[PDB]
Amino acid sequence: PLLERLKRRVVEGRKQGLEADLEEALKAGHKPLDLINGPLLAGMKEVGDLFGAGKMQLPFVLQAAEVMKRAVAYLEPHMEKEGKGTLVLATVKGDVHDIGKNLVDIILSNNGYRVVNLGIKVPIEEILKAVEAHKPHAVGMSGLLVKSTLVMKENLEYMRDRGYTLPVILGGA
Amino acid sequence: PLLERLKRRVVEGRKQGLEADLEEALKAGHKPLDLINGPLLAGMKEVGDLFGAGKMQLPFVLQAAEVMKRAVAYLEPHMEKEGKGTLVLATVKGDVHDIGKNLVDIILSNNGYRVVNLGIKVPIEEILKAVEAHKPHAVGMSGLLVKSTLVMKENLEYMRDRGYTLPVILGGAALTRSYVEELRAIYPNVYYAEDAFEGLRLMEELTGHAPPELTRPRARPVGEAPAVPRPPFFGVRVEEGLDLATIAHYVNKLALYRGQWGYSRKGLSREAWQALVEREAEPVFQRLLKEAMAEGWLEPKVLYGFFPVAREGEELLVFSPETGEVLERFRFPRQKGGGLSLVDYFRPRFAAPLGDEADWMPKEAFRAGARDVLGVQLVTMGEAPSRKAQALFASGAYQDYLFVHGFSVEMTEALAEYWHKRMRQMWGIAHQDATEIQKLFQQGYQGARYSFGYPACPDLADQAKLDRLMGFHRVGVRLTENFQLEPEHATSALVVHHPEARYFSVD
Amino acid sequence: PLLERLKRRVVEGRKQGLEADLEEALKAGHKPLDLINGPLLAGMKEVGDLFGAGKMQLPFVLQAAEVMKRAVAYLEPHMEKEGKGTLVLATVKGDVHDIGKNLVDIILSNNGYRVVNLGIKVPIEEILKAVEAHKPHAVGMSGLLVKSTLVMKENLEYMRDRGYTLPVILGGAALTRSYVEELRAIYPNVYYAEDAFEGLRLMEELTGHAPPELTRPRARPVGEAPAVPRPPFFGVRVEEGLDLATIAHYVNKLALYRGQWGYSRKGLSREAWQALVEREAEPVFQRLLKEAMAEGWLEPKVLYGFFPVAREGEELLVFSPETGEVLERFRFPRQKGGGLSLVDYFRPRFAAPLGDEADWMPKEAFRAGARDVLGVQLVTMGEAPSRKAQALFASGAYQDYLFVHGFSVEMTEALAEYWHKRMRQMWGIAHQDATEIQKLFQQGYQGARYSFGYPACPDLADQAKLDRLMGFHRVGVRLTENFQLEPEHATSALVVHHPEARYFSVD
Amino acid sequence: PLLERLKRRVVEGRKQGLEADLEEALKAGHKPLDLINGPLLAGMKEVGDLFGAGKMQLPFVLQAAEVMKRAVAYLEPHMEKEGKGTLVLATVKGDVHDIGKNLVDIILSNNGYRVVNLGIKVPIEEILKAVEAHKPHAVGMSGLLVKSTLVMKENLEYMRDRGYTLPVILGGAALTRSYVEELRAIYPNVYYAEDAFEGLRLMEELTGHAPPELTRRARPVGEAPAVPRPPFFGVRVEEGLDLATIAHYVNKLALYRGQWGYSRKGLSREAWQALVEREAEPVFQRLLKEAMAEGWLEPKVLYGFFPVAREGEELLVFSPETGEVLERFRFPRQKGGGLSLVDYFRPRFAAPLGDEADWMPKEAFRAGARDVLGVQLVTMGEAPSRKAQALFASGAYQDYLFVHGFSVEMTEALAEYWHKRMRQMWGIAHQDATEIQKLFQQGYQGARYSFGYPACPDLADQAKLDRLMGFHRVGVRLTENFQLEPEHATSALVVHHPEARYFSVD
Ligand code: B12
Ligand code: B12
Ligand code: B12
C-alpha cells in the first residue's frame, strides 16, 4: 500500500516524490496527525533501531530526518496544532559550542517530541524562565569543556535552591 | 570513477549534466570512440538485458537512447568519420507506416550499428541502389498490412533474380514467423523480427558479435432482426469540428499505456498500477492533449453515412439512394461448415417488410429490392500527427516520439469509437448503450463495427469499393496501391444495426 | 569430518589423495559398502542434480565418475560382493557406434546400478542370453542411424514373440521420442531416453527409487548453370599422407566444445566464453593434436573422384568414364508439391553443351548422353581413434574418453570440409571461397556437398551404390548390414559444382 | 577456474596434487609472484578470518600454512627475488622456549611477511645487529617466565639508550597486557600480543595494510595426624619408566583443547566425544607408538625426601648425613596473615606426634628437624625438543604442533604419575582416586607445589632445589633466568600434610 511506501521514504531518505505521496494518502483516508505517528514514526523508530545495531550510518539518519521534517512542513497548513512531551534544551553559560545540542534537537523533533532550543551561552535564569513558560518533561544542558560541566553543577545547585525537581539530562564531550 | 558515471547516465537516462561529464572525461584522457565503444555501449547493452528480462519499460529504453544519441553528437566534432556494421532499412512500396522501422533505427543506431533509413513507399530499385553504395551486412523491410508482405515477397523474387544473397531481415505487424519460413523457398537468407531487439540480435549474429542461433454450423443459425432501423439520411456527409476533449474520454487507457507506450501492468498490484498511471502515464496523456489542442497537430475529421442494402445469396448489395441501381456487391467469407458470415446480418432482397420501412426506404432502391440499412464511417486525425512525430524523431526526442505516436493512434481509435456511439444515436439504436466508457470496449451496444482487413471481412481491396461509395478525398484520405489509408492515422468501418452482431473469426 | 571430505572429492573430482582418505576412513571403522552407498553416492547424486540444473558441465561430471570408479576399485579387494538393479546394455546388430551406450554405462555404474555392457553389433539372441543369466530390471539398446531403429523394432517383435515383458530403454541419435511411442504398439514397456540422465531416471523409477513419472504456394525454380566445370580426372583415386595440422584449421570449435564436449556457452558473455576457451577448451584441443600426431591414433585417408552424369527425369545417371555404360542411377526425393530435388542440379541427358565440354568429356559417356560432372569424396580417420578411445574407457579415464572421442569426430568432419575445399580447387571452382575459416561453415563457396542419410538424399542404401563406384576398401572402409561405415569415424559426400546448390529439407 | 582451485587447496589444506596444479597455472600463463600475492594469500587471509571468528581450529590453520609453504617452495626456482615487511623475531637471553615464537613465524611467513627467526637465548646485541642488516618494520621478543619479561625490559632500556624508536611487539606466557602498558614509559612503541593472530594484526597496522587500531581471608591450619616416614632420606635417580604407564596420566582436555586447540564449547557432549574418537585420540595413539619406537621421549626422574622444620616463616632443610641446615625457604604469606606453605610443616624441636624419633636421622633430629618434605624433578630430555625442531624445519607445521603439545602434556603426566608413586613410597596412598580423572581434582593426601606458582613464586629457589638434588644427574640445567633446560622438565615440592591444597597470595 501507500502506508508502507511512506514508511519506506523515511528509512531510505527519499525526498523527491514525497509531497505527491502525502497529497495522495489523505485521499486514501488518513489524517495529517495520523500518518505522522504511524508509518513515518515507525520508519524513524526503525532508523533508530538500525543505528543502535550499527546497520545504518549517521549521514543517512539525518537524511531520514530531512524527509520527516519535510513531511511535517507539508502537513502543517492542514493541521491547527502538540507533541509527545517537551525538552527545554540549552548550551551552558560561557560556551559557544552547538553541534551536539542541535543534533539532539534534530533526533527528538523528528521522533515527535517538542524541542525549545535556547541557543548558546544561556544562563540558568533564562533556562528556568523557559521551563515556567513551556512546562516541559525535562531540561537539557550541553557543554564542551570540563569548565562547562562546572557551570552545569552550579545550575543544578541553582535549580534545587529554587525547588525544581524536573529531570535534568546532561550531555557533553 | 567517471567511467561508471557515464554508464550510469545511459541506464538512468540523465541528459542534465551529460555535456559537463563528457568534457571532463576527454580532458581526463579518454578518446571519443574509447568512451562510445566503452562505458556508454556497456550502458545500452545493460538496458537491452533489462528490457529482455522485463525490468525496464520501453519509455526508459528510449530515454537511454536519447542520452547515447546526445553523447555521440557532442563527441562528433572531435572524431573524424563507421559502426559495427550497416543495415539499409526501408518501408515497402505502397506503405506509409514508419513507427516500427524508426524503432529499429533508434535501437540499432544507439547500439553502435549504422542505419541508412530510406523512408516510406521505397521500391526495391531504390533499396538495392543503396545496397550498392553502402555495401551493408543486411537489408531491412517494414510493412503494416498483409498486402505489404506480398510486396516483400516480390522484392525477394527481384533480389534473387538480380543475384543478391545478402540477409533480408523482414518485420511487420501483419507479418508472422510462419510466413517468413515459407519465404525461405524464394530467398533462403530471410529472417523474421518480432521486435527491434530481435532485429538487434540478428544484426549481432550477422556481424559476428554473437554465436549463430536465429541464423541457421455448430452455432446459432441466422436470426431475423426486431426491425429495420431508420437512418437520419441516405448517402454520405462530412463532419469536422469535433472536440478533442470529447474524443479523449473514449481513449482505451490500457491499450495506450501497455499496448503502445509499453508501461508494464503485469507483475504488480492494481494499487501499484494505479499509482504508476497517476505519476507516469496520466500526466503525459494530459500534456499531449493540451499540446494537440493548442498546437493543432490532431485534425479530427469524419466521413459517414447510410445506404439501402440487401442480401442476395452470399453477396451484400449496396443500392443508390438516388437511382436505386446496385453500386457495389460484397462477397464476404463464411466460417467452415456453413457457419457465420456478415451477409447473415442483412435482410434478403425483396424480403416482406418487418415494419413500416416502405414509408421511408428510398423509392427506387426499395422497388429494386433493398430491404435493410447499412451504416459506414471513415475517421482520420490528418497528416498533422504524422508530421509532428517525424519532427520529434528527427530532433532525437525518441521518448516523446513514442508517446506522441501512440497518443495519435489510440486517439484515432477513440474517434472511431466516439463516432460509433454517434452513429448509433442518429440511427436510433443508442437506447442500450453502456453506463461506463469501459463497457463500450466490450461491445456494450446494439450491433457492431467491422473494419475491412479483420477476419470477418479481410479483403483490403474492398476499401476501394468503400471509397467509391463514400469519397475518401472529402476528408483528405487516399488509397495506396496496397490499399492502405493515407494518412496512416485513419480507420474505416462498416456499422451494423442487427443486435445479434458480434465479432467472430473465419481463421 | 572425513565423511564430508569423501563427498567433496567426488563433486570436485579430486583423485590425487583419494586412496589415502579411503584407507583413513576404513581404519576409523567405516565398511566398504557403507562408503559406496553413503558419502560418495551422495556426491554423485549432487553432481546429477547440478547437471540437471545447468550448474556443472559434462567434462566435470565424468571427472566425478573417475573418482567414484577409482574409489570402488580400491574398496573391491576388502569387499566380497550387488548394486541397486541391473541394466543389460548393447548396441544393436549392424551398428558399431559405442559413445552413447558407453556414456550410459559410466553414469549408471557410478550411480550404483550394475551395467552389463555387451559391446557392438550385438544380436537379440545374445542380448536375451544375458537377460536369462543376470535377470536385470531393464534391457538397453543403442543405435546411430534410422536403420538401427528398424533393428530395435525387430528386436521388440522378437522379445514379445519369446514372451519378455521386461522394460526396454531405447536411445539413439536418429531415434526420436515420437517413434518410441508408436513402438509401444508392438512392445508397451518401451521407453525413450534423450540422454544418459534420462536413462538414469528411468532406471530409478523401474527399481522403485523414484516417483513414477516417465513410467506410465512458394518456390524458386533452379536455372541452368554457367558452365560444366572440368575435373582433374574421371574415376576415383586414393590420397593418404595428409597433415593433421592442416585439417585442424577446419575444426568447428563450437561443435567440438559445446556440441561434443558439453562446455556450455549460453548464460555468459562472449568475453566469459572466450576466457573459458583459453583456459579449458583450447589447451585440451592443443594437447590431443600433439598426441594424435606423435602417437599416430588418427590416420586420415581420402577416397575421391569425379564422374560423367546426366539427369533423365527424376533419376541421376552415372556413366562409366571408360565404357560409357550406366553404372548407377539415383532416384532422389523431391519436396512436397513439386519443389526442389538434387536431380535439378544436373544437366539433362543429351543436353546441347553449354561450352566446349565435348572437347574433354569422356568420348563414350558423352555419346551415351552424359552432360554434367559429379564429384564424390569419402573421408575417414581409421580404426585407430576407435581403438584409442576404447583403451581410455576401459582404463577408466572417462574425461579423456569424452575429449578424445569428440576430437576424433570433429576432426573427421574437418577432413570432409578441408577436402571439399580441395575438391573445389581441383575442379577449378575455388575463385569464390571464404576469406575466413568461419564462413566455410556457412557454405561460403560454389556448390555444396550432400551426404547420404540427410534429408535431401536420405536413403542410406544408396551408400552401397557409392561403394560400387568408389571402392571403400581402398581406404579400409566397409559397409555393415544397416549401411553404416566401419570404422565409425568416416563420412561420404556427393560434391555438386552448381552455384545455386544449397541445403534444403524434404522433412 | 584453477585460480579458485589454488585458493581452495590452502583453505582445505590439501597438499596432495598441489605441485600439479601450480605447474598447470604457470604454463597456462600466471606468474609465481602473481599467484603468491593473489589466490594463495587470499586463501591464507580467509583462514585468518575464520580463526578470528571461531569457525576454523588451530590444527587446520597450520595445515593451511603447510600448503602455502609448499607452494612458495615450488615457485622459488622460477622467481629471482621482498615480503610486505620484515619482523626480526627472537626468544630472549636466558630462555630456551620456542613454540610461541615459532608459531608467530609460521603465521606471519605464510601471510606474506618476512620472518628472521634468531632462535633462543638471543641477546639484544645480536637482535639489533639483525635490525641493522635487514631494516625491519618491527622487532619481536618471546619469553616464557616472568624473569624473561625482566630481560625484555632491560632490552627496551638498551634499545632506547641506543636510540631505536621502531615498534617492539612483545609476547609470552607470563607476560600480561597490564605490564606492557607500564613498559610504554621506557619505550613508547611497545605492543602486547596475546596470540600470533594479534601479532599479525599489529604487523598489518605497522606496514600500513590496516587502519590504526591497536597502534595509538584465612582459615587455621591444624596439626597433622602423624609425620609419615619416607622410603629413604636423600635423592635418587629413576630412569626405567614405561611410556605406556605415563600415558594413562595425560590430561586429555589440556592436550586437545589447551595445547592442540580443538575447541569443545558450543557443541554437544556426544559431538565432542565423536571429535575425540575421529581426530584427537588417533593422533595421541600415533605419537605414543612413534615416541616409544623412535625413542624421542626419554623419561627420567630425580626424587627424594629430607628432614625439615619450620623456624618462624622459614622452612629449614637439614642434611640426612650431617644434620646441618642446607637451605631455608622464606615462602610468602597471604594478605593480612593468611596461609603460607611453612604452615604445613612441624616447628623445630616440636615434641614428636608419634614414634618419628625411631627413624628420623639422628643428627637432623638432634638439630631439631621434625617433619619430612618430598621433592621431585621430572624430564623427558632434549630428545622431544630436537624432534619438534626437525618437524618445524621440514615444514610439517601441523605435526610440529601435535608433537610439541604431546611432549608437554606427557611431561606433566610424568609429574602426576610420579606424585602417585611418591605417595605410595611415603605410605600416604590409602586415600588415592579410583579413576585417573579424579587425580587432576587433587584426589589424594597432600599436594605438590612447583616453584613459580603463587604459593611459592620465587623461581630463584629452583637453584636451592638443584643444590639439594643435583639436576645434572638427569641432564637438567638452570639458565640465568632460572629456566630448566631441557624445556620439557618440571620440579615440584611434595607435601604429605592432608590439609594442604592450592591457594593464591594474589
Ligand atoms: C493501432 C492499430 C491501428 C491504427 C494504425 C496506426 C498504425 N498504422 O500504426 C489505426 C487505429 C488507425 C488502425 C487502422 C487500421 N487497421 Co489497424 N492495427 C492497429 C494495431 C491494433 C496495433 C498497431 C501497433 O501500434 N503496432 C505496434 C507497431 C510499432 O508494431 P510494428 O509496426 O509491427 O513494428 C514492430 C515489429 O513488427 C518490428 N518491425 C516492424 N517492421 C520491421 C522491419 C525490420 C527490418 C525489423 C528488424 C523489425 C520490424 O518492430 C516493431 C517493434 O519494435 C494492430 C494489431 C497488431 N499489430 O497486431 C492493427 C492491425 C495492424 N490493423 C489492421 C487493419 C485491418 C486496420 C485497417 C485496414 C482498418 C480499416 N480501414 O479497415 C486500418 C489500416 C491502417 C491504414 N492507415 O490503412 C489489421 C491488419 C489486417 C490485415 N492486414 O489483413 C491489424 C493486424 C489488426 C488485426 N488483428 O487483424 N489500426
Ligand atoms: C558427429 C556426427 C557424425 C560423426 C559420427 C561419429 C559418431 N557417431 O560419434 C561423423 C562426422 C563421422 C558423421 C558421419 C555420418 N553422419 Co553424422 N552426425 C553426427 C552428429 C552431428 C552428432 C552425433 C553424436 O556423436 N552425438 C553425441 C552422442 C553421444 O549422442 P548419441 O549417440 O545419440 O547418444 C546419446 C543419446 O541418444 C543417449 N543414448 C544413446 N543410445 C542409448 C541407449 C540407451 C539404453 C540409453 C539410456 C541412452 C542412449 O546417450 C547419449 C547422450 O548421453 C549427428 C546429429 C545428431 N545426433 O542429431 C549426425 C547424424 C547422426 N549423421 C547422420 C548421417 C547421415 C551421417 C553419415 C551416414 C554421413 C554419410 N556417410 O553419408 C555418417 C554416419 C557415420 C557412419 N560411420 O556411417 C544423420 C543420420 C540420419 C539417418 N540415419 O538417415 C544424423 C542424425 C544427422 C542428421 N541431422 O540427419 N556423423
Ligand atoms: C605447558 C606449561 C608447562 C610446561 C612449560 C614448558 C613448556 N611449555 O615446554 C611444563 C609442563 C614443562 C611446565 C613446567 C613449568 N612451568 Co609451566 N605452564 C605451562 C602452561 C600450563 C601452558 C603454557 C603453554 O602451553 N604455552 C604454549 C605456547 C604455544 O604458548 P606461549 O608460550 O604463551 O605463546 C603464545 C603467546 O604468548 C604468543 N607469543 C609468545 N611469545 C611471543 C612473541 C611475539 C613477538 C608474538 C607476536 C607472540 C608471542 O604466541 C603463542 C600463541 O600463538 C602454563 C599456564 C599458562 N600459560 O597459563 C604454565 C606456566 C608457564 N608454568 C609456569 C611455571 C611455574 C613453570 C615451572 C617453573 C614449574 C616448576 N618447575 O617449578 C616449569 C618450568 C619449565 C622449564 N623448562 O623451565 C608458570 C610461570 C609462573 C612464573 N613465571 O612466575 C605458568 C604461567 C603457570 C601459572 N599459571 O602461573 N609448565
Author numbering:
A (entry chain F): 663 to 743, 746 to 837
B (entry chain C), C (entry chain E): 663 to 743, 746 to 880, 895 to 1185
D (entry chain D): 663 to 743, 746 to 880, 896 to 1185
Sentences from the paper on this structure:
Cobalamin-dependent methionine synthase (MS) is a key enzyme in methionine and folate one-carbon metabolism. MS is a large multi-domain protein capable of binding and activating three substrates: homocysteine, folate, and S-adenosylmethionine for methylation. Achieving three chemically distinct methylations necessitates significant domain rearrangements to facilitate substrate access to the cobalamin cofactor at the right time. Here, we use a thermophilic MS homolog (tMS) as a functional MS model.
